[PDB]
Amino acid sequence: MEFPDLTVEIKGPDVVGVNKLAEYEVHVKNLGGIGVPSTKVRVYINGTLYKNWTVSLGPKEEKVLTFSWTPTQEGMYRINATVDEENTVVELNENNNVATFDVSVVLE
User: Fold this and answer.
1) Are 68 and 22 in contact (CB under 8 A)?
2) 9, 63 in Cβ contact below 8 A?
3) How much is the CA Rg of the chain, to the nearest whole Å?
4) Which positions ≥6 away from 59 have C-beta within 8 Å?
C-alpha cells in the first residue's frame, strides 16, 4: 500500500524594498517513497497567482525552483506555495502540501 507525501518549501528575503527585485527559492520534495508525475507547484501572493510549474518527483526526490518578484506597491504581502491543488493523488499528509511565507515591502 504505497501512498506519496509531497511538500513545498519557500525560502528567501522576508523584507524587501518597493520597486526592487527579490529572488525566492522553492524546494519541492517527495517524502512518501513513491514516484509522482501529477506534481503541479503554484505560487500565490495574497491569493494572487504569480506563476505555476509542472514537475515529477520520484521516491524521495527534490527539485529546486527559483523566481524573481518585484513589489511595485508598498505594504505586507504573503507568499504561499501549493502542490497538487487538483487533488489527483491520496497522500499521507494533507497539511504538508502548503507553505506560507510573510514578506514586508517598504519604501526605504
Assistant:
1) yes
2) no
3) 15
4) 30, 32, 33, 34, 35
Binding residues for Mn(2+): 5-6, 84, 87, 89, 91, 93-94, 96-97
Indicate the pairing of strand 22-30 with strand 15-17.
unpaired
Say which CATH architecture domain 1-108 belongs to. Sandwich (2.60)
Place of cell 502548503: 98
**Among residues 97, 78, 76, which one has the least CA distance to residue 24?**
78
What would the grid cell of residue 20 be?
A: 526592487
Tracing cell 518585484 back to the chain, one arrives at 70
Give the distance, in angstroms, between the CA of residue 48 and the centroid of all CA atoms in the same chain: 13
Q: Which residues are annotated as a binding site?
A: 5-6, 84, 87, 89, 91, 93-94, 96-97
Cell numbers placing 56: 515529477
